[PDB]
Amino acid sequence: IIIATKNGKVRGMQLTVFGGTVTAFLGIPYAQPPLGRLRFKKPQSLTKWSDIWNATKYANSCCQNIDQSFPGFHGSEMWNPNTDLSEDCLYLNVWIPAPKPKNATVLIWIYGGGFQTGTSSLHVYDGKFLARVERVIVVSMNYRVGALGFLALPGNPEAPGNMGLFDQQLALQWVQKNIAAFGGNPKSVTLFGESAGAASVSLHLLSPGSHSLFTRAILQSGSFNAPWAVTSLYEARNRTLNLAKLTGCSRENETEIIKCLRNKDPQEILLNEAFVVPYGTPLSVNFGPTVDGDFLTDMPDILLELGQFKKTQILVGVNKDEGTAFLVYGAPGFSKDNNSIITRKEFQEGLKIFFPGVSEFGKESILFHYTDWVDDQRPENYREALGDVVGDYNFICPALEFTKKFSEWGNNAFFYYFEHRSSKLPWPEWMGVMHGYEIEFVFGLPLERRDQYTKAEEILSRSIVKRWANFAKYGNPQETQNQSTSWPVFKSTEQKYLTLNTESTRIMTKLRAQQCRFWTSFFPKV
Ligand SMILES: *[C@@H]1O[C@H](CO[C@@H]2O[C@@H](C)[C@@H](O)[C@@H](O)[C@@H]2O)[C@@H](O[C@@H]2O[C@H](CO)[C@@H](O)[C@H](O)[C@H]2NC(C)=O)[C@H](O)[C@H]1NC(C)=O
Ligand SMILES: *[C@@H]1O[C@H](CO[C@@H]2O[C@@H](C)[C@@H](O)[C@@H](O)[C@@H]2O)[C@@H](O[C@@H]2O[C@H](CO)[C@@H](O)[C@H](O)[C@H]2NC(C)=O)[C@H](O)[C@H]1NC(C)=O
Ligand SMILES: CCCCN[C@@H](Cc1c[nH]c2ccccc12)C(=O)NCC[C@H]1CC[C@H](N(C)C)CC1
Ligand SMILES: *[C@@H]1O[C@H](CO[C@@H]2O[C@@H](C)[C@@H](O)[C@@H](O)[C@@H]2O)[C@@H](O)[C@H](O)[C@H]1NC(C)=O
Ligand SMILES: *[C@@H]1O[C@H](CO)[C@@H](O)[C@H](O)[C@H]1NC(C)=O
Ligand SMILES: *[C@@H]1O[C@H](CO)[C@@H](O)[C@H](O)[C@H]1NC(C)=O
Ligand SMILES: *[C@@H]1O[C@H](CO)[C@@H](O)[C@H](O)[C@H]1NC(C)=O
């Protein structure tokens, strides 16, 4: 229960899972805490310790603003931090099977949260089930978010940008140098993440310094080519300066400003982080990944178009109702407490919320493409139309476009369409299969019969858990034993994908073909 690592020994704890044992190492540091002079800087390597580090509780979560739109509501508060917020926050967790495996495949989770929020200690990121059921090692890390993680003065090493991405990268190399001591195989490492974590995974495929740190990639409801995923260098410096003025650190040496921001307290930075965005939407990434010339050597849409990425297998997918989650955070006429039937005027007001800096012609083209009804008389026409708009534009169509262009360079790609609505889902039914609510099924939470899931959900999570693990281990996300539907590869031509539900798992073709031709081919012009 004590493992010797390259920086010192760590003590774990035993866990009882499904009549078996999993050994958990919660809260292993992987960098010098980025405090004082080290704020906004790339993570510094960690120096030796001679103690026995007790890794028996989740460590701090990094500083972040917290969702307060629904106090006391589990649907929003399950995503909020469940440990103390602190700049001292670069730690990681390890779940290994008991008894110690000999050469186990490693799954590295990268959480999402719009690059502004998130923590690895969330209940739905508990990797003890995957270690128990599939005999893999699960690793997750905290990375810096918000301004503290992605504030950028491009070229300036006091604030170069992409610090959170380098946090992730340093965790990946920790697994490279250390996971063998835990019985893991550093040569079979599979990254997987959701939303902003899925966008991080896709950027690790593009950044050269990470190509040796992992084997395969899984992308859940996100990719770097999504419109929220990358901050342009214009936007990047404009928001850094807005933050500088908003806290009285405005100056003209550019290191000037960083040293002044370095002595403000974290809560002041977090307070003014919220307002640096000129055209703010619920999907706005206040401080995100930039083209920094270090992690990102070029504009990532160019690298993807010209095949400049790690050649390997990918598993990509999306949920049925990606967009609904965001409609009750700003769209008029929407509420989680009624059926949110909205009118045409409310739909048009919703597009101005989600596309504030867009042409009036652009907004009409959105309404033109999405308001051709099979039924002029269905009252929920506009309600669902706005949800599909936000989902197709921000998540579904960028993920499909990333998969085609990645597969065009010869690698096996697998695409899924998750359409099961959790039986325990706390949000209303009109929101459907929401953004982020496949995560629990991936992590095997319905396998716990103690916790209120239907038996069909147990079998569905059990099959997903096998497909994900077979993808990590073997690069082929099949369930080979129980007469399952064979998951075909995604090709540029036929574009086959697998649907995941409790009823019938089916092969289908060309997901959202018409909608995505609008968003990917035409809309980038307006
Ligand atoms: C940070 O950006 C805002 C927004 O700039 C506008 O929007 C851009 C997308 C682009 O169209 C620019 O040419 C525009 O100037 C800067 O300016 C504010 O812009 C908004 C709307 O235009 C509005 O609040 C004010 O007119 C502008 N405020 C001021 C003080 O001029 C803002 O100044 C930028 N931050 C800087 C320059 O430090
Ligand atoms: C659904 O609810 C929204 C939100 O209204 C709030 O939540 C309700 C459940 C109730 O507690 C209200 O008192 C709250 O104000 C409704 O949107 C509001 O509608 C009224 C009248 O149309 C309008 O004056 C407000 O500005 C609206 N709030 C907005 C746009 O944010 C909506 O009408 C409800 N729809 C249905 C079908 O019940
Ligand atoms: C004007 C600047 C706004 C701040 N910018 C964003 C930061 C962000 C957080 N999560 C993201 C997910 C994607 C993109 C971006 C974000 C923001 O706070 N959105 C409103 C808050 C809630 C938070 C929970 C989300 N899901 C659980 C549904 C929905 C939105
Ligand atoms: C590290 O932990 C040592 C042993 O702790 C044991 O496990 C924890 C979970 C508690 O139940 C404790 O009562 C057990 O004895 C400690 O002896 C040691 O002091 C700890 N080190 C530090 C620096 O706190
Ligand atoms: C683990 O597997 C790799 C190949 O993936 C092999 O090179 C390595 O020697 C193995 N280590 C063991 C069995 O300890
Ligand atoms: C001010 O800027 C110069 C370059 O313009 C830089 O060399 C110097 O270090 C900056 N000031 C401080 C205190 O670092
Ligand atoms: C296969 O089916 C059996 C029941 O016959 C079930 O117990 C098992 O969990 C299933 N395995 C997978 C990987 O779904």
XYZ file of C-alpha atoms and ligand atoms in Angstrom:
698
model
C 0.000 0.000 0.000
C 3.169 2.108 -0.193
C 4.698 2.726 -3.627
C 8.150 4.167 -4.312
C 8.064 6.926 -6.937
C 10.893 8.884 -8.526
C 10.303 11.794 -6.092
C 9.546 9.844 -2.912
C 7.249 7.246 -1.428
C 3.458 7.602 -1.335
C 0.907 5.795 0.839
C -2.484 4.866 -0.585
C -5.659 3.414 0.872
C -7.755 0.310 0.288
C -11.257 0.467 -1.173
C -13.984 -2.194 -1.207
C -15.635 -2.303 -4.648
C -18.065 -5.032 -5.774
C -16.702 -7.604 -3.350
C -13.184 -6.759 -4.487
C -10.401 -4.315 -3.664
C -9.114 -1.207 -5.421
C -6.102 0.717 -4.127
C -6.495 4.486 -4.454
C -3.799 7.173 -4.374
C -5.643 10.488 -3.990
C -3.714 13.748 -4.101
C -0.210 13.074 -5.436
C 1.586 16.348 -6.268
C 3.110 16.569 -9.730
C 4.557 20.103 -9.794
C 5.788 22.904 -7.610
C 2.673 24.766 -6.401
C 2.334 27.718 -8.807
C 2.293 30.421 -6.126
C 3.986 33.785 -5.781
C 6.470 34.421 -8.569
C 5.276 31.189 -10.227
C 1.718 32.395 -10.888
C 0.883 32.428 -14.631
C 4.105 30.493 -15.308
C 4.445 27.027 -16.780
C 4.481 24.293 -14.113
C 7.875 23.849 -12.490
C 9.268 20.391 -11.845
C 8.825 18.950 -8.361
C 11.781 18.487 -6.034
C 12.464 15.376 -3.944
C 10.796 14.453 -0.663
C 12.010 11.897 1.865
C 8.753 11.486 3.812
C 5.945 9.080 3.012
C 3.393 11.270 1.265
C -0.087 10.304 2.447
C -2.250 10.238 -0.685
C -5.470 9.296 1.086
C -7.775 12.248 0.337
C -8.519 14.396 -2.694
C -6.327 17.487 -2.777
C -7.306 21.111 -3.380
C -9.181 22.135 -6.490
C -7.713 25.107 -8.344
C -9.326 28.540 -7.995
C -12.478 29.074 -10.066
C -15.791 30.884 -10.058
C -18.699 28.652 -9.081
C -22.092 28.032 -10.680
C -24.669 29.695 -8.467
C -27.626 29.922 -10.814
C -29.458 27.119 -8.943
C -28.568 27.050 -5.236
C -29.396 23.737 -3.593
C -30.098 22.083 -6.965
C -28.099 18.899 -7.534
C -28.304 19.241 -11.324
C -25.892 22.185 -11.235
C -24.125 21.686 -7.892
C -22.833 18.194 -8.732
C -20.434 19.999 -11.088
C -19.211 22.495 -8.464
C -15.904 21.911 -6.629
C -16.043 19.398 -3.776
C -12.694 20.338 -2.206
C -11.131 23.614 -1.101
C -10.160 26.090 -3.795
C -6.473 26.953 -3.741
C -3.724 28.033 -6.096
C -1.783 25.088 -4.586
C -3.672 22.611 -6.645
C -1.455 20.648 -9.104
C -2.140 17.106 -7.864
C -3.284 13.837 -9.441
C -5.079 10.627 -8.468
C -4.353 6.958 -9.226
C -6.701 3.958 -8.967
C -4.986 0.593 -9.462
C -6.577 -2.876 -9.287
C -5.961 -5.194 -6.379
C -3.892 -7.271 -6.496
C -1.325 -4.988 -8.184
C -1.502 -5.628 -11.942
C 1.581 -6.520 -13.928
C 1.262 -4.416 -17.110
C -2.109 -2.646 -17.066
C -3.427 -0.222 -19.666
C -3.711 3.311 -18.263
C -6.681 5.656 -18.738
C -5.954 9.347 -18.109
C -9.011 11.543 -17.530
C -9.047 15.269 -18.322
C -12.105 17.023 -16.938
C -14.077 19.717 -18.720
C -15.748 22.902 -17.594
C -15.196 25.449 -20.341
C -11.513 25.834 -19.332
C -12.835 27.953 -16.434
C -14.116 25.326 -13.972
C -13.704 21.687 -13.045
C -11.923 19.308 -10.688
C -10.904 15.661 -10.773
C -12.501 14.926 -7.374
C -16.080 15.029 -8.693
C -18.280 12.061 -7.812
C -18.790 11.225 -11.501
C -15.028 11.066 -12.184
C -14.493 8.250 -9.651
C -12.222 5.773 -11.425
C -12.429 3.017 -8.808
C -15.111 1.162 -10.788
C -13.039 1.093 -13.989
C -10.040 -0.224 -12.048
C -12.204 -2.898 -10.423
C -14.276 -4.030 -13.397
C -11.779 -3.738 -16.278
C -8.412 -4.115 -14.466
C -7.068 -0.840 -15.890
C -5.289 1.939 -14.024
C -7.197 5.242 -13.882
C -5.359 8.561 -13.548
C -6.855 12.048 -13.291
C -5.278 15.415 -12.544
C -6.252 18.931 -11.557
C -5.083 21.613 -13.977
C -5.256 25.386 -13.679
C -8.367 26.997 -15.165
C -9.572 30.513 -15.836
C -7.089 33.370 -15.974
C -4.691 31.605 -13.603
C -4.449 28.810 -16.180
C -4.816 30.513 -19.561
C -4.054 34.246 -19.238
C -1.775 35.087 -22.144
C 0.665 37.731 -23.280
C 1.936 35.762 -26.308
C 5.726 35.532 -26.241
C 6.039 36.810 -22.663
C 7.239 33.968 -20.373
C 5.708 35.681 -17.326
C 2.312 34.842 -18.869
C 2.763 32.779 -22.060
C -0.659 31.111 -22.139
C -1.763 27.467 -22.096
C -0.484 26.975 -18.536
C -3.380 24.641 -17.769
C -2.540 22.586 -20.850
C 1.061 22.367 -19.650
C -0.235 21.266 -16.240
C -1.987 18.406 -18.045
C 1.172 17.680 -20.041
C 3.293 17.503 -16.885
C 0.797 15.027 -15.427
C 1.112 12.906 -18.576
C 4.887 12.758 -18.135
C 4.443 11.869 -14.455
C 2.521 8.812 -15.650
C 5.362 8.153 -18.088
C 8.094 8.250 -15.433
C 6.155 6.677 -12.567
C 3.181 4.510 -13.543
C 5.358 1.409 -13.994
C 5.938 1.400 -10.227
C 2.155 1.036 -9.822
C 1.971 -1.909 -12.226
C 0.922 0.126 -15.257
C 2.196 0.040 -18.825
C 3.500 3.508 -19.817
C 3.386 2.279 -23.434
C -0.436 1.830 -23.441
C -1.847 5.148 -22.201
C -5.256 6.373 -23.364
C -6.326 9.955 -22.749
C -10.029 10.603 -22.388
C -11.957 13.731 -21.495
C -15.278 15.470 -21.897
C -16.174 18.912 -23.258
C -13.237 21.214 -22.493
C -11.326 18.095 -21.470
C -12.169 16.548 -24.832
C -10.868 19.724 -26.475
C -7.694 19.393 -24.397
C -7.235 15.795 -25.574
C -7.548 16.872 -29.208
C -4.940 19.586 -28.609
C -2.586 16.982 -27.129
C -2.837 15.171 -30.469
C -1.616 18.394 -32.110
C 1.081 19.555 -29.710
C 4.427 17.857 -30.463
C 5.624 17.764 -26.840
C 2.788 15.367 -25.933
C 3.116 12.885 -28.799
C 5.358 10.565 -26.746
C 3.194 10.745 -23.602
C 0.146 8.731 -24.712
C -1.061 6.064 -27.148
C -4.718 6.712 -28.050
C -7.419 9.316 -27.490
C -11.119 9.437 -26.590
C -13.086 12.648 -27.193
C -16.452 13.055 -25.440
C -18.583 16.050 -26.510
C -15.666 18.232 -27.558
C -12.792 19.042 -29.924
C -10.401 21.917 -30.563
C -12.251 23.040 -33.699
C -15.365 23.877 -31.684
C -15.969 27.648 -31.815
C -15.461 28.095 -28.046
C -12.263 26.066 -27.883
C -9.443 28.458 -28.877
C -8.918 32.113 -27.961
C -7.452 34.119 -30.822
C -4.342 36.140 -30.014
C -6.375 39.314 -30.526
C -9.066 38.236 -28.055
C -6.348 36.843 -25.780
C -4.433 40.086 -25.287
C -7.650 42.126 -25.259
C -8.978 40.168 -22.278
C -5.631 40.222 -20.469
C -5.718 44.021 -20.710
C -9.377 44.251 -19.660
C -8.383 42.252 -16.580
C -5.409 44.570 -16.014
C -7.585 47.692 -16.060
C -10.349 46.057 -13.997
C -7.855 45.514 -11.145
C -5.786 48.686 -11.541
C -2.733 46.880 -12.928
C -2.808 48.701 -16.279
C 0.714 49.520 -17.458
C 2.799 49.397 -20.712
C 5.884 47.302 -20.037
C 4.065 44.028 -20.446
C 5.899 42.364 -17.561
C 4.842 45.435 -15.618
C 1.258 44.178 -15.664
C 2.006 40.533 -14.855
C 3.969 41.448 -11.725
C 1.086 43.664 -10.594
C -1.449 40.903 -11.262
C 0.874 38.585 -9.325
C 0.260 40.447 -6.054
C -3.519 40.713 -6.317
C -5.334 38.046 -4.357
C -6.941 35.104 -6.213
C -10.465 36.296 -5.392
C -9.861 39.658 -7.074
C -8.681 37.901 -10.245
C -11.664 35.540 -10.089
C -14.061 38.446 -9.508
C -13.051 40.363 -12.642
C -12.494 37.258 -14.790
C -16.260 37.229 -15.320
C -16.437 40.539 -17.214
C -13.436 40.484 -19.583
C -15.629 39.030 -22.360
C -17.068 41.756 -24.666
C -19.825 39.622 -26.225
C -20.569 37.231 -23.374
C -22.590 34.051 -23.862
C -23.142 31.082 -21.538
C -20.602 29.257 -23.741
C -17.888 31.929 -23.590
C -14.399 30.768 -22.601
C -13.050 33.786 -20.703
C -9.435 32.555 -20.804
C -8.709 29.587 -23.036
C -6.063 27.888 -25.150
C -4.078 30.207 -27.409
C -1.612 29.733 -30.245
C 1.435 30.289 -28.031
C 4.248 29.051 -30.277
C 5.113 26.449 -27.615
C 2.233 24.054 -26.911
C 0.466 25.232 -30.089
C 2.897 26.016 -32.906
C 0.257 27.100 -35.455
C -3.453 27.768 -35.759
C -4.882 24.303 -35.020
C -7.349 24.363 -37.930
C -4.333 24.562 -40.251
C -2.533 21.668 -38.556
C -5.642 19.479 -38.756
C -6.252 20.405 -42.403
C -2.653 19.518 -43.350
C -2.388 16.342 -41.266
C 0.042 17.623 -38.623
C -1.021 15.525 -35.652
C -0.228 12.290 -33.846
C -1.233 9.323 -36.003
C -3.253 6.914 -33.847
C -6.789 5.682 -33.246
C -9.506 7.978 -31.914
C -12.928 7.472 -30.356
C -15.192 10.511 -30.722
C -18.833 11.083 -29.870
C -21.600 13.435 -28.792
C -24.895 13.452 -26.894
C -28.372 13.879 -28.353
C -29.221 17.170 -26.641
C -25.871 18.923 -26.264
C -27.333 22.420 -26.369
C -30.214 22.316 -23.884
C -28.043 22.627 -20.758
C -27.037 26.160 -21.771
C -30.520 27.483 -22.602
C -31.542 28.036 -18.965
C -28.417 30.141 -18.365
C -29.555 33.124 -20.421
C -32.165 32.303 -23.050
C -35.480 34.104 -22.436
C -38.589 32.054 -21.774
C -36.527 29.082 -20.575
C -36.569 27.534 -17.113
C -35.720 24.154 -15.631
C -38.992 24.418 -13.666
C -41.475 24.470 -16.567
C -41.667 23.053 -20.083
C -40.110 26.238 -21.546
C -42.433 26.540 -24.532
C -41.165 29.676 -26.267
C -42.463 31.730 -29.176
C -40.855 32.840 -32.429
C -39.967 36.214 -30.899
C -38.334 34.436 -27.950
C -36.387 32.179 -30.321
C -35.077 35.243 -32.170
C -34.095 36.776 -28.833
C -32.296 33.543 -27.966
C -30.076 33.714 -31.047
C -29.011 37.219 -30.024
C -27.985 35.767 -26.651
C -25.900 32.975 -28.177
C -24.656 34.830 -31.297
C -24.214 38.400 -30.010
C -21.430 39.502 -32.356
C -23.044 37.917 -35.419
C -24.563 39.793 -38.377
C -28.324 40.278 -38.542
C -28.162 38.348 -41.816
C -26.247 35.587 -40.043
C -28.934 35.358 -37.366
C -31.664 35.127 -40.009
C -29.805 32.338 -41.816
C -29.805 30.370 -38.550
C -33.555 30.863 -38.169
C -34.109 30.088 -41.860
C -32.339 26.713 -41.635
C -33.854 25.623 -38.313
C -37.492 26.816 -38.548
C -38.739 24.629 -41.417
C -41.240 22.587 -39.440
C -42.684 19.181 -40.111
C -45.470 20.742 -38.023
C -46.315 24.434 -37.919
C -48.614 23.541 -34.995
C -46.287 21.799 -32.515
C -45.876 24.276 -29.618
C -42.344 23.113 -28.721
C -40.997 23.774 -32.238
C -38.965 26.833 -31.258
C -37.897 25.438 -27.870
C -36.188 22.415 -29.420
C -34.965 24.395 -32.439
C -32.914 26.672 -30.181
C -31.496 23.676 -28.322
C -30.436 21.981 -31.554
C -28.860 25.238 -32.768
C -26.642 25.556 -29.695
C -25.803 21.848 -29.722
C -25.117 21.488 -33.447
C -22.980 24.633 -33.662
C -20.960 24.262 -30.460
C -20.514 20.497 -30.151
C -22.010 18.020 -32.620
C -20.846 19.467 -35.941
C -17.279 20.392 -34.825
C -16.854 16.865 -33.453
C -18.023 15.340 -36.740
C -15.768 17.653 -38.745
C -12.759 16.798 -36.570
C -13.410 13.075 -37.032
C -13.585 13.209 -40.841
C -10.441 15.297 -41.253
C -8.563 13.160 -38.725
C -9.673 9.914 -40.386
C -8.748 11.282 -43.833
C -5.080 10.733 -42.907
C -5.499 6.977 -42.583
C -6.260 6.256 -38.925
C -9.159 4.268 -37.525
C -11.849 6.510 -36.041
C -14.976 5.468 -34.153
C -17.962 7.763 -33.622
C -20.834 7.273 -31.178
C -24.171 9.009 -30.572
C -25.280 8.800 -26.931
C -29.071 9.077 -26.663
C -30.007 7.586 -23.273
C -31.516 9.948 -20.711
C -30.415 8.983 -17.201
C -33.231 7.676 -15.008
C -31.910 9.781 -12.116
C -31.418 12.952 -14.197
C -32.350 15.922 -11.959
C -33.077 18.334 -14.846
C -36.486 18.439 -16.585
C -37.365 16.016 -19.362
C -37.543 18.705 -22.061
C -33.750 19.048 -21.812
C -33.327 15.421 -22.890
C -29.915 13.754 -23.133
C -27.883 16.597 -21.729
C -24.302 17.776 -22.100
C -22.076 15.914 -19.648
C -24.485 13.158 -18.585
C -22.828 10.293 -20.411
C -19.842 10.650 -18.063
C -21.424 8.604 -15.270
C -22.100 5.759 -17.700
C -18.496 5.835 -18.943
C -17.186 5.608 -15.375
C -19.452 2.683 -14.468
C -21.572 4.356 -11.791
C -24.747 2.436 -12.840
C -22.799 -0.760 -12.101
C -23.457 0.028 -8.414
C -26.866 -1.573 -7.865
C -27.066 0.354 -4.573
C -27.590 3.648 -6.398
C -31.046 3.891 -7.986
C -30.233 3.118 -11.642
C -32.421 0.813 -13.696
C -31.077 -2.599 -14.660
C -31.062 -1.617 -18.344
C -28.736 1.231 -17.370
C -26.454 -1.249 -15.600
C -26.177 -3.318 -18.779
C -25.652 -0.187 -20.894
C -22.881 1.157 -18.654
C -21.370 -2.333 -18.502
C -21.177 -2.487 -22.300
C -19.810 1.058 -22.638
C -17.199 0.267 -19.979
C -16.100 -2.762 -22.009
C -15.992 -0.840 -25.301
C -13.943 1.999 -23.785
C -11.512 -0.434 -22.151
C -11.166 -2.549 -25.286
C -10.430 0.679 -27.156
C -7.745 1.659 -24.647
C -6.229 -1.831 -24.500
C -6.565 -2.879 -28.141
C -7.623 0.144 -30.207
C -10.956 -1.464 -31.139
C -14.046 -0.445 -29.107
C -15.872 -3.753 -29.501
C -17.882 -5.834 -27.055
C -17.010 -9.237 -28.486
C -18.668 -11.695 -26.092
C -22.364 -10.819 -25.729
C -23.481 -10.789 -29.395
C -23.157 -7.014 -29.560
C -23.463 -4.787 -32.600
C -20.067 -4.448 -34.258
C -18.815 -0.854 -34.134
C -17.597 0.062 -37.645
C -14.831 2.545 -38.292
C -15.749 6.086 -39.297
C -14.717 6.748 -42.901
C -14.822 10.041 -44.801
C -17.236 8.526 -47.345
C -19.932 6.516 -45.553
C -19.534 8.157 -42.115
C -20.956 5.310 -40.044
C -21.563 5.785 -36.328
C -22.874 3.756 -33.401
C -25.811 4.807 -31.233
C -25.718 4.007 -27.516
C -28.989 3.392 -25.676
C -30.721 0.828 -23.477
C -33.010 -0.372 -26.295
C -31.424 -1.029 -29.681
C -27.802 -0.255 -30.499
C -27.678 0.489 -34.230
C -25.310 1.539 -37.006
C -26.411 4.755 -38.725
C -24.985 7.073 -41.374
C -24.160 10.773 -41.724
C -25.280 12.263 -38.430
C -26.993 15.663 -38.795
C -25.909 15.886 -42.427
C -28.045 18.894 -43.368
C -27.501 20.842 -40.133
C -23.719 20.426 -40.229
C -23.435 21.503 -43.872
C -24.942 24.790 -42.690
C -22.598 25.237 -39.726
C -19.341 23.982 -41.234
C -19.631 25.104 -44.869
C -21.791 28.247 -44.885
C -21.933 29.843 -41.413
C -18.140 30.467 -41.157
C -18.597 32.982 -44.001
C -21.048 35.411 -42.351
C -11.509 44.650 -25.544
O -12.536 44.580 -26.607
C -13.590 45.560 -26.550
C -14.465 45.282 -27.747
O -13.933 45.900 -28.909
C -14.982 45.941 -29.880
O -15.310 44.618 -30.270
C -14.295 43.914 -30.996
C -14.832 42.512 -31.252
C -13.959 44.676 -32.261
O -15.138 44.842 -33.033
C -13.409 46.046 -31.868
O -13.124 46.761 -33.065
C -14.434 46.812 -31.028
O -13.851 48.014 -30.526
C -12.966 46.959 -26.539
O -13.808 48.100 -26.712
C -15.161 48.195 -26.259
O -15.984 47.732 -27.241
C -17.341 47.577 -26.822
C -18.166 47.388 -28.078
O -17.488 47.849 -29.240
C -17.802 48.764 -25.973
O -17.942 48.357 -24.616
C -16.905 50.000 -26.070
O -17.222 50.751 -27.236
C -15.401 49.673 -26.057
N -14.772 50.157 -24.836
C -13.820 51.099 -24.826
C -13.282 51.475 -23.478
O -13.414 51.625 -25.859
C -12.090 47.068 -25.304
O -11.627 48.398 -25.102
C -10.943 46.080 -25.460
N -9.979 46.223 -24.380
C -8.895 47.008 -24.455
C -8.711 47.771 -25.736
O -8.100 47.102 -23.527
C -41.332 29.320 -17.563
O -40.635 30.084 -16.569
C -39.972 31.235 -17.108
C -39.128 31.825 -16.002
O -39.907 32.593 -15.095
C -39.458 32.302 -13.756
O -39.674 30.935 -13.447
C -41.060 30.522 -13.355
C -41.050 29.029 -13.065
C -41.823 31.342 -12.310
O -41.290 31.089 -11.020
C -41.694 32.833 -12.642
O -42.316 33.564 -11.592
C -40.213 33.232 -12.767
O -40.087 34.604 -13.122
C -41.015 32.198 -17.656
O -40.353 33.325 -18.214
C -40.905 34.539 -17.675
O -42.204 34.809 -18.193
C -42.792 36.033 -17.721
C -44.152 36.124 -18.373
O -44.122 35.599 -19.693
C -41.894 37.226 -18.052
O -42.431 38.401 -17.456
C -40.476 36.990 -17.550
O -39.622 38.036 -17.999
C -39.958 35.657 -18.070
N -38.611 35.398 -17.588
C -37.557 35.302 -18.406
C -37.840 35.498 -19.866
O -36.427 35.076 -17.988
C -41.830 31.502 -18.736
O -42.884 32.354 -19.170
C -42.421 30.189 -18.219
N -43.075 29.468 -19.301
C -44.055 28.579 -19.113
C -44.603 27.933 -20.350
O -44.479 28.306 -17.993
C -19.598 36.123 -20.175
C -18.693 34.994 -19.727
C -19.446 33.768 -19.212
C -18.525 32.760 -18.527
N -18.117 31.641 -19.398
C -18.675 30.284 -19.067
C -17.605 29.343 -18.441
C -18.021 27.935 -18.607
C -18.411 27.086 -17.606
N -18.762 25.830 -18.126
C -18.606 25.892 -19.522
C -18.837 24.894 -20.477
C -18.599 25.221 -21.795
C -18.148 26.511 -22.144
C -17.932 27.474 -21.187
C -18.154 27.196 -19.835
C -19.882 30.368 -18.043
O -19.698 30.626 -16.868
N -21.186 30.079 -18.509
C -22.398 30.101 -17.641
C -22.284 29.119 -16.424
C -22.797 27.660 -16.646
C -21.849 26.637 -16.012
C -22.251 25.180 -16.253
C -22.388 24.830 -17.759
N -22.861 23.368 -17.963
C -22.857 22.592 -16.690
C -24.243 23.306 -18.515
C -23.341 25.846 -18.422
C -22.954 27.304 -18.141
C 0.757 9.571 7.224
O -0.092 8.518 7.705
C 0.485 7.740 8.763
C -0.484 6.617 9.056
O -1.831 7.048 8.928
C -2.724 5.915 8.973
O -3.748 6.060 8.019
C -4.592 7.235 8.170
C -5.659 7.139 7.087
C -5.182 7.369 9.595
O -6.245 6.442 9.773
C -4.090 7.143 10.662
O -4.724 7.077 11.935
C -3.330 5.847 10.375
O -2.360 5.584 11.384
C 0.745 8.638 9.968
O 1.352 7.876 11.006
C 1.654 9.791 9.563
O 1.811 10.692 10.655
C 1.073 10.542 8.366
N 1.992 11.579 7.923
C 1.698 12.882 7.958
C 2.768 13.809 7.462
O 0.620 13.295 8.370
C 4.564 -4.272 -20.855
O 4.218 -4.308 -22.259
C 5.170 -3.665 -23.119
C 4.597 -3.702 -24.516
O 3.366 -2.998 -24.593
C 6.517 -4.369 -23.004
O 7.468 -3.719 -23.840
C 6.985 -4.344 -21.557
O 8.210 -5.056 -21.427
C 5.926 -4.958 -20.639
N 6.340 -4.861 -19.248
C 6.172 -5.836 -18.347
C 5.511 -7.089 -18.840
O 6.541 -5.712 -17.183
C 10.562 46.541 -18.497
O 10.705 46.183 -19.874
C 12.045 45.867 -20.264
C 12.027 45.679 -21.763
O 11.218 46.662 -22.394
C 12.507 44.632 -19.505
O 13.849 44.333 -19.874
C 12.413 44.879 -18.004
O 12.740 43.679 -17.308
C 11.009 45.359 -17.600
N 10.996 45.745 -16.196
C 11.180 44.888 -15.185
C 11.135 45.478 -13.808
O 11.372 43.690 -15.373
C -22.456 -10.287 -20.796
O -23.673 -10.902 -20.333
C -23.616 -11.399 -18.989
C -24.917 -12.125 -18.732
O -25.001 -13.319 -19.497
C -23.380 -10.233 -18.042
O -23.339 -10.703 -16.699
C -22.067 -9.556 -18.407
O -21.860 -8.422 -17.573
C -22.078 -9.114 -19.871
N -20.784 -8.563 -20.240
C -20.635 -7.379 -20.843
C -19.225 -6.969 -21.144
O -21.593 -6.672 -21.133
